[PDB]
């Protein structure tokens, strides 16, 4: 059985695309035939979206040789065990000719596992080598995490304002939180809105505002980073 | 049961059941190529003599599924100087093993566990000796594992201090310094000194899980009584037991032999059996028939506020006989970057796709302790290593490390009473004293306050306290109120104040 493919490496050059590179196996044990590549979605982290990123977080801490025996130890055992030298599915494709391939139409900003196998002329009967495998994330759709529609607003008691806006239907990965920028003459005030609040309310109530006219904007943070700010929101607090 | 004299386990989890009755393993353990055919648990296992090997175990997610109580590895014999090897554990995601209290002999090797989290959440220097010999490579990048402890204790990990965890559910449990070098039971009552790890009762050689020196008839003991003899480096056995043990089938298979009060399968180098096959070895009188480098591996810790311990290895190129090392150290300034930022409002976002040099000189050995230190200062350490000729050429360039002192416990708690005043719009202004000697710095304050219960919390920056000496709470509802405040020091949160009681009238 051939070795696993060597030097499996990959990148994403486009949203919905991944490029993958590797080297032929160290020991063909026969004339090499082909490689088999498999890939599997990793899930969007439910473990992560449980965290309230508007809550606390930790402080960022700043700002002569002979030991190849360590393999002989296994090879000699294997040679004495034999007699003598004589959440999601895998997708799969099999390599024709070259130690490179590109996978496309992937979920944008999803993480994938990729497995690559290397097969010799006898692998058709013996089977192919085990996989070498890697993880990579697809490019974000730039601004796809920006707010997919208009903001809406309503007054609330105690000179409060509730702002209502649609959630992005597809994030880059996840919607973590929203930022609200707002103020009377100028948008001095800034608020962090957790995903759990939006999930409850579909929005947030800004409360106990000082009197006056106001403007605002909101910005989402996806796992690909901040989205765009909303269009401005215009609102007012009556003195009377 | 004491299983042995050597276990090679491979292929199937149903063979793993052989441990159902084992609690100590005499000889090696091999665990190879397992990939599931399921739960299995072996809390009976507590001590391994010799080494542990795991190799290409797919299907296993964490070792705390199997061996929560594996408390000591003696390592009396080693795989190429390793007492533990973990290799290619393609699905291993956390160690667990959360009762692991000591590894006596041997180095550590940890390789290609590309999904293994909880890599550096363990203070290896608390468990094992020459950690400089460890090897941790190709595993899951800790920067992107993003380990978590709950929220359990923290310690001066090299230049850092950080929380210590075996896994998200278990911290790297250890005794207080009230036991010193002594072990302890779970509620920190110190063990017997001959004991190792936890004890079902303190100071009782009959209540040990394992013995450091030797074992006999349920008793941990420093050395074998006269008619009792050292066996496999861990227990005493009588003269006639080893006389009844037959070695591996071989042309030279013979009974065991007794020497220095050890029992052995064959005589040690420089000794041979007496010609009667014999119980004793005898020595053969003839030959038996057939400029410095920088210092290495500089490492340091704080056991105590105002103290630092530093350990290192001899230099790579003595270029002579080595004479000694010269250590210099200097107080580093606390980062001026840190003072300006409003950590009560900065959060960042994720993304993916001035002081003197001291000098002292070492006589003989690569260890020293420095004292009368600032209880929470960061120090740069420069170590020079000098051979006999560094006197004329000058001495080597430095190998260097950073370390921070053990924080002064409660030095960051609020030193005096809180004061309060009314303000308009049903507002309250709170003024309170700054800690005199904060562990480095006070970054911010948390205020806990409320009418019936302290639902509301606020963060106060050090700059705000410098301007106002306090903070104003505004547009409260009427009623009676209580509050407390908490500081965040660089050493972490301080203590809460005693409660503050105050009230807001509606008019």
From Swiss-Prot, chain B:
PTM section of the record: Autophosphorylated on tyrosine residues in response to ligand binding. Autophosphorylation occurs in trans, i.e. one subunit of the dimeric receptor phosphorylates tyrosine residues on the other subunit. Ubiquitination is facilitated by pre-existing phosphorylation.
Tissue distribution: Found as a hybrid receptor with INSR in muscle, heart, kidney, adipose tissue, skeletal muscle, hepatoma, fibroblasts, spleen and placenta (at protein level). Expressed in a variety of tissues. Overexpressed in tumors, including melanomas, cancers of the colon, pancreas prostate and kidney.
Glycosylation sites: 21, 69, 102, 204, 274, 303, 321, 480, 493
Mutagenesis / variant outcome for changing residue 105 to Q: In IGF1RES; has decreased IGF1R function
Effect on the protein of changing residue 112 to N: In IGF1RES; has decreased IGF1R function
Disulfide topology: 3-22, 117-145, 149-165, 152-171, 175-184, 179-190, 191-199, 195-208, 211-220, 224-236, 242-263, 267-281, 284-288
Extracellular side: 354-507
Residue ranges constituting the Fibronectin type-III domain according to the UniProt record: 291-353, 414-507
Location relative to the cell: Cell membrane
Disease the record associates with this protein: Insulin-like growth factor 1 resistance: A disorder characterized by intrauterine growth retardation, poor postnatal growth and increased plasma IGF1 levels.
Family: Belongs to the protein kinase superfamily. Tyr protein kinase family. Insulin receptor subfamily.
Role played: Receptor tyrosine kinase which mediates actions of insulin-like growth factor 1 (IGF1). Binds IGF1 with high affinity and IGF2 and insulin (INS) with a lower affinity. The activated IGF1R is involved in cell growth and survival control. IGF1R is crucial for tumor transformation and survival of malignant cell. Ligand binding activates the receptor kinase, leading to receptor autophosphorylation, and tyrosines phosphorylation of multiple substrates, that function as signaling adapter proteins including, the insulin-receptor substrates (IRS1/2), Shc and 14-3-3 proteins. When present in a hybrid receptor with INSR, binds IGF1. PubMed:12138094 shows that hybrid receptors composed of IGF1R and INSR isoform Long are activated with a high affinity by IGF1, with low affinity by IGF2 and not significantly activated by insulin, and that hybrid receptors composed of IGF1R and INSR isoform Short are activated by IGF1, IGF2 and insulin.
Subunit annotation: Tetramer of 2 alpha and 2 beta chains linked by disulfide bonds. The alpha chains contribute to the formation of the ligand-binding domain, while the beta chain carries the kinase domain. Interacts with PIK3R1 and with the PTB/PID domains of IRS1 and SHC1 in vitro when autophosphorylated on tyrosine residues. Forms a hybrid receptor with INSR, the hybrid is a tetramer consisting of 1 alpha chain and 1 beta chain of INSR and 1 alpha chain and 1 beta chain of IGF1R. Interacts with ARRB1 and ARRB2. Interacts with GRB10. Interacts with RACK1. Interacts with SOCS1, SOCS2 and SOCS3.
Name of this protein: Insulin-like growth factor 1 receptor
Organism of this sequence: Homo sapiens
């Amino acid at each position: 059985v051939p070795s696993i493919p060597l030097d499996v490496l990959s990148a994403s050059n486009s949203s919905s695309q991944l490029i993958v590179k590797w080297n032929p196996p160290s020991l063909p044990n026969g004339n090499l035939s082909y490689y088999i590549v498999r890939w599997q979605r990793q899930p969007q982290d439910g473990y992560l979206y449980r965290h309230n990123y508007c809550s606390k977080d930790k402080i960022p801490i700043r700002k002569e040789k002979e030991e190849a025996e360590y393999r002989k130890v296994f090879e000699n055992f294997l040679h004495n065990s034999i007699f003598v030298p004589r959440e999601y599915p895998f997708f799969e494709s099999r390599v024709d000719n070259k130690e490179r391939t590109v996978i496309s139409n992937l979920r944008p900003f999803t993480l994938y596992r990729i497995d690559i196998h290397s097969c010799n002329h006898e692998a058709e009967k013996l089977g192919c080598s085990a996989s070498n495998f890697v993880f990579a994330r697809t490019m974000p759709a730039e601004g796809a995490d920006d707010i997919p529609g208009p903001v809406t607003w309503e007054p609330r008691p105690e000179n409060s304002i509730f702002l209502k806006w649609p959630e992005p239907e597809n994030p880059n990965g996840l919607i973590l939180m929203y930022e609200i920028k707002y103020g009377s003459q100028v948008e001095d005030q800034r608020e962090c809105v957790s995903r759990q609040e939006y999930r409850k309310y579909g929005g947030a109530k800004l409360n106990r505002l000082n009197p006056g006219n106001y403007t605002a904007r909101i910005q989402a943070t996806s796992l690909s980073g901040n989205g765009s700010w909303t269009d401005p929101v215009f609102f007012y607090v009556q003195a009377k």
